[PDB]
A paper describes a structure:
However, the cavity created by the interaction between the two subunits at interface 1 can accommodate only one NTRD at a time, forcing the second NTRD to localize elsewhere. No extra density is observed for this latter NTRD up to residue 59, thereby suggesting it being highly flexible. When superimposing subunits with and without NTRD, the overall structures are very similar (RMSD 0.4 Å). Analyses of PfISN1-Apo SAXS data confirm the high flexibility of two NTRDs, and SAXS restrained modelling indicates that unstructured NTRDs may be located at interface 2. In PfISN1-Apo, helix α8 (residues 171–175) carrying one of the catalytic aspartates, occupies the binding site of the phosphate moiety and Mg2+. In this conformation, E173 (Motif 1) interacts with H398 (Motif IV) while D178 and D394 are exposed to the solvent.
All structures adopt a tetrameric assembly displaying a cross-like shape, in agreement with the quaternary solution structure. Each subunit consists of four domains: an “N-Terminal Regulatory Domain” (NTRD, M1 to K59), an “OD” (D60 to T143), a HAD-like Catalytic Domain (CD, F144 to K270 and K371 to Q444) and a C2 cap domain13 (K271 to N370).
Residue numbers in the entry:
A (entry chain D): 60 to 315, 327 to 361, 364 to 399, 402 to 444
B (entry chain C): 11 to 21, 25 to 39, 42 to 45, 52 to 176, 181 to 317, 327 to 444
C (entry chain A): 15 to 48, 51 to 176, 180 to 196, 198 to 275, 277 to 317, 326 to 430, 434 to 444
D (entry chain B): 59 to 177, 181 to 318, 327 to 400, 404 to 431, 434 to 442
């Protein structure tokens, strides 16, 4: 809600000034030169001054070609009473990031909790599985999830079986199955795929040196502080819920199920962080309300581990998620992040990613089949 | 009559909260001015509880604050035009009953203990619950008519526990269904949408005379239907209830659709939409084509509504209508669900303190359906809330039952 | 004219109009810089509408380059609103914008202000509300290629106690050689001499410079907002213009006038008893006021109590169903309800002199009055000046209507 | 108190729109006073600190409930049906609670001269109160005007106040308790038997001040001088750069018979200065101030000077009270001593009259 709101008001002022359908190249190219200036000198840039929480530009964002591409198809400037909206600027920034990938991509990462199964149940989309299939032939595919199953690959495969079903038919002969990765526990458990389209655990020895270290005792007392507070949350609000503890995660689960108020869940999240602050713990963790789980580790550092493990340059990486569902350390600080809000947008970006170096193909981020 | 209800049939959310293609699931994360204009009475109470919370007194004795609010509510019930509440909030509505807002808060606070929170103040959704509680607690003498907004709270129908509650309440009061769907006077198509509800009526509502209390208002306020002993819908002739409705000349109805048709044809050209226009007897719509369905941008559909409203003002038309979106298509109806409610209580000769409407104000504008003007309204956002409110209505007068507006089994 | 004599503006917890607390020019601009967006937007919606446009151009880092395409598009809307004030696109975006009696060259006004003060060279301070108040004042002055026949001043806001500025008495004098009108809420019946005492040093200047060429006849004074008219004679002395002479240009209000005074008096008597005020009520033929008593100086009435009393009187006016035009103001230390309207007093002066509205200009400070009482740009072109330095700058530009118009600094 | 005043403004607004503020609101007020008392005991872990981050520290227990009753009984703002409490009335109530918390009196009373004493000093009734208060406490005046060691230049501004001391505060030796701190926190002065200012040697009080070396003080002025030099050329100013040893200023030139700089340019230049210093990794407390017509960046701050006079005169923080105007410097002294926010001379004399009667007199902070 920083860079998007930045352009939204700019377009709102061009709208009410009655010039947004005319030649706004002078305004667009000044913003683009701002973005190019920020890409070269990201510290003490002019964009940094206006938007202090702005990330790092790993690419040169062609925001002028992104607006012209979106406006030629959807004619948002021909609307007399409806200015450009939050979602249209978001589509334009997704359009600019895809257009900036002239070199191509070697690693494409997904947020499964938001992109592959936002419903909360196993993968289920053949067309989406087909896009991931053909993209796996050209690049590495990694999937990041907050599921807490420790290191048993059968539980993670249960959620992605419909996706691994498609790998069985087309992704075994050419050896592309070797490049598919799964990071469980946000950033603590890694899995790969074999010839039989089955997930197997990658031992820590093969990738532990790519993850920043956190003390075992530090991990535990994070869960200890989280445990006592949830116990008080149960007694304070008379909840019919139970605490489920794992090696690096602890959760507030309702008994089979019972409904916990969304506000009480948010209240519990604010008691946890505030308590961890009072004990002067500096280790990164992720207290998450799903409509509660406290994982030691976040999905952003999990994207970092995968970039080091595969030895990929920041330019050739792109992450796909839905920032509506979390409001968190932004994953945009570690990779190029597309923001998709429904499956039709996800299949639109994946189709344009399949045609990156092709000039005849126009980038689309909203309608897969239009 | 609809002349007394402030309709704004022809009168911006940069975040597009009402866009359900992007707002796909339970909404909770995201909105101040948007929630305020949907109901200024809720946000009026949200700001008062927030100050009591930040003054560190919301879990102590706040009866002094609640009772002065309740007295303002009682006074607004007695003189709704010159009351203090009418001055602080201008678009409140009419309190057809005295609202016991204090006991409604104690009831919600005793079960959910929202004042025990240290960091989350009472939210907009919780005050809406407390309001629904006050509306139900005010029904001390019962209900004679219960209206449902089918498009917002019922839809086809597929909920056996919901059908059972309606059947149980059908034995005690008139049940009316108001839908924006228009299938002319053919009750077959309306029967297909309410089939599982009518099939339940066949089993439990035929022997007693309860099936005679079921009404269906199609076309928002244009096509009325009743239920026979075979649990089958049949048209109530227009001549039977036409005098309960503000008369709109047939020449005015067609001209409204003619204005809407030419605006929509221009919207098709301006944006290259793969859509066509299907025209009904009293309604007209912009419908996306089927891909050899297509998609029209949510912002283009919102642009088309405003153009249609602005062109109707240019043509000096004061007839009530409802130009609205609906996610995927555009629809202009020469009809109004608020007048549809007024027709029903005039036909049934119901006094206003014995009527209750159930709808989801998130999915409609306050210009089309103004808040608290036809009857007392319940704002529900999910079926579990609907089931909880119906069971609470089912257990009126039953002192053993504590009214619940959020959780059915809890 | 969309008058809201009994309506009220949104409440201001910051009390910007409280002159006792906001008594420094340094205090005002700091609070203007922060706690002020809602009040400034209500004082003039077209200025704040332009502030947000430049703020977006500034933040996009293009305000230093060629922004003519934005400025000329804004100017086209001002021309279309001048040609169709009822259903202009500008009317849709700004409901309370008002009437443009002239074609405003807003592009040429921005250039003129920017080339002298270089507000565009700033990197951290975008254009402010007061600078887009200045560019618009310049746009209205540049719009008078066909000049002015009448120039009106709000003496309560722009000239004064009594008139005391000979340099300001120099500008009006040579301007008097066009019609000059003085509008004042001060009510002294048809007593021509009591109005003289407050314009004493202005009229004494007229005696030395405006008698020979006969310019003294074109000077007018509207007293009681719109109740008592005065002219100037050969001896620089005000004399009463009989009400019979001009009353047909004014909306007739039934001698209804007395009932407004009875309503306000009874409300102010309750106000005194409610807050234990050491004040009395003074009643004139067409006005009534709450004045504090003398200290056995004079006592002090709270600004908020004066605010409460104003709202009460206007609500009591509504419940009595009186729709006659009037003005109840706060006045800082004393309250006054007058059966008259300065905006109506301007229309009388325009009708009395039969002058086109394109040839009329008004000088006043909108910080000191409400828009429901004097609507924006509905009687004539209006210049919003904040201190005598801006008044002399604007008057000097009107004099030389080689000269580059200046509205901010008299010398510079 | 900008954050604390709006805290109560918003709470009294809800009591207004709930129709209960004229009724008995003792439960709401004493719930607030309990939060204030808990903050006085544990300021770092208080509920109030979570609500207001910049609340600071309360050196006294605030009787905000008694302050509300006192203000409302005389002015009856709860009888207003349409004008809820304003920012100023809560500010008046916050001044009442602080004066009411001084049960044991004051040993030091401090004045910001630029904000509350300069309408040169010309007010006899104000000079009469200061003379009376000097007979029972230490009176300190803090000024941003820096004339270095030269006491004759400072005395010009306080002449009519010092000449009032000459006729009343000399026989009892009250002049020995009058102090002047020029340069914000750099030049201390005292008064002698002739009602005349004399400078105090810095060696005698420098140990009460955090030390900044000639190397650091000068670099503040070097960066400011070059940023101000760019500003004069950027906007074509007819102004000069006046450099002193501990301050440097942008001063407009006089007219041929002074010129005026746009307030936005003076604000544009302060921001350029501050952001350039941060680029140079300087963390020393300086004060870049706008002041309407001329810019001044002084090495030092008025708050540091209040701490200097506290340690020098051996004054407990409960016995200190500062009088200033925070409308003029909202770009805080509340962290060093009890601070009253006054906006006009009548408020100053009202608050001062209440301080003379700290030990039947109902406190007043509005009209004397």
């Amino acid at each position: 809600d920083s860079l998007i709101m930045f352009l939204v008001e700019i377009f709102r002022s061009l709208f009410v000034s009655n010039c947004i359908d005319k030649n706004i190249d002078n305004v667009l190219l000044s913003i683009e030169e701002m973005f190019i200036d920020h890409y070269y000198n990201p510290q003490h840039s002019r964009l940094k001054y206006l938007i202090d929480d702005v990330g790092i530009f790993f690419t040169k964002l062609p925001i002028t070609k992104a607006f012209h591409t979106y406006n030629k198809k959807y004619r948002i400037t021909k609307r007399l009473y409806a200015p450009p909206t939050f979602n249209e600027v978001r589509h334009i920034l997704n359009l600019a990031q895809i257009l900036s990938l002239e070199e191509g991509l070697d690693l494409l990462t997904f947020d499964a909790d938001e992109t592959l199964y936002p419903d909360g149940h196993d993968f289920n989309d053949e067309v989406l599985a087909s896009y991931i299939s053909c993209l796996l032939k050209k690049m590495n595919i990694a999937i990041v999830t907050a599921a807490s199953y420790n290191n048993d690959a059968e539980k993670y495969q249960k959620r992605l079986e419909n996706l691994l079903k498609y790998f069985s038919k087309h992704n075994i002969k050419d050896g592309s199955y070797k490049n598919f990765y799964v990071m469980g526990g946000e950033s603590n458990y890694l899995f790969k795929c074999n010839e039989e389209a089955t997930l197997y655990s990658v031992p820590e020895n093969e990738w532990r040196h790519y993850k920043k270290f956190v003390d075992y005792d530090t991990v535990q007392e994070i869960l200890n502080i989280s445990e006592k507070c949830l116990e008080k949350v149960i007694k304070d609000f008379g909840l019919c819920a139970q605490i489920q503890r794992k090696e690096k995660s602890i959760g507030l689960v309702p008994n089979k199920n019972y409904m916990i108020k969304y506000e009480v869940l948010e209240e519990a999240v604010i008691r946890i962080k505030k308590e961890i602050i009072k004990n002067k713990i500096t280790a990164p963790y992720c207290a998450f309300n799903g409509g509660l789980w406290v994982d030691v580790g976040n999905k952003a550092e999990g994207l970092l581990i995968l970039q080091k493990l595969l030895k990929i340059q920041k330019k050739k990486c792109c992450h796909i998620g839905d920032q509506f569902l979390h409001s968190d350390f932004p994953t945009r600080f570690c990779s190029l992040t597309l923001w998709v809000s429904n499956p039709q947008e996800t299949k639109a970006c994946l189709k344009s990613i399949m045609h990156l170096n092709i000039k005849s193909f126009i980038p689309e981020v909203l309608y897969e089949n239009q």
